[PDB]
Design a protein around this nucleic acid. Sequence first.
RNA 1: GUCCCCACG
RNA 2: GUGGGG
Length: 214
Amino acid sequence: YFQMWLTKLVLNPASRAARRDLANPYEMHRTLSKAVSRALEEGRERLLWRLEPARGLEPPVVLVQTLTEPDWSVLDEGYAQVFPPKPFHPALKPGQRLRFRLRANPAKRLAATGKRVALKTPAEKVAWLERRLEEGGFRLLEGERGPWVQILQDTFLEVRRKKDGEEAGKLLQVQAVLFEGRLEVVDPERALATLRRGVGPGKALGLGLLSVAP
RNA sequence: GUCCCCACG
RNA sequence: GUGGGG
């Protein structure tokens, strides 16, 4: 009995709370977790989101995926224009090809030190995507000149948490890479699990939401 | 330029 | 080194 609910939110830069969440991924996460907070307590929810930041005429847009039905009545308005939540039941088939979008943290844990660190080059960011995808029931489409993936954005998130009331807390340091391309469904059952579970670290930071479409 | 916690069939 | 959670 699987659906994923998708909610689009168009945030309002006039709002101090919006502006806070748009500057800090961890604040953003707190706000979105309220829509599904009883379900978060119940252990079988996986809140995923992706922010498309404001550019030009385009306001800031967040795509939010939850496995249970969200209640956005918790948000104040002024905060965002909330599009009606909708459930999706993707019907995935072997050999079916799809566009995808994914902001993710392509990373490795170093043998020598045990630190999780960012993969340095585009080629290794793609190799990482390739592997997580394949283990997740997908396969990058291979074009004439290489794979059907583009790195649109590659940024180093450095997000301060607060602590003990209003003290400086941990600095969350995570490399964020926006991928867009085409893929093939290899194993439908696995692919649906990947869509529901997400790809890679920083899920509570707006990473790991794999979006596919015809 | 990875701050933390968990697992290691 | 692989993944998960923040």
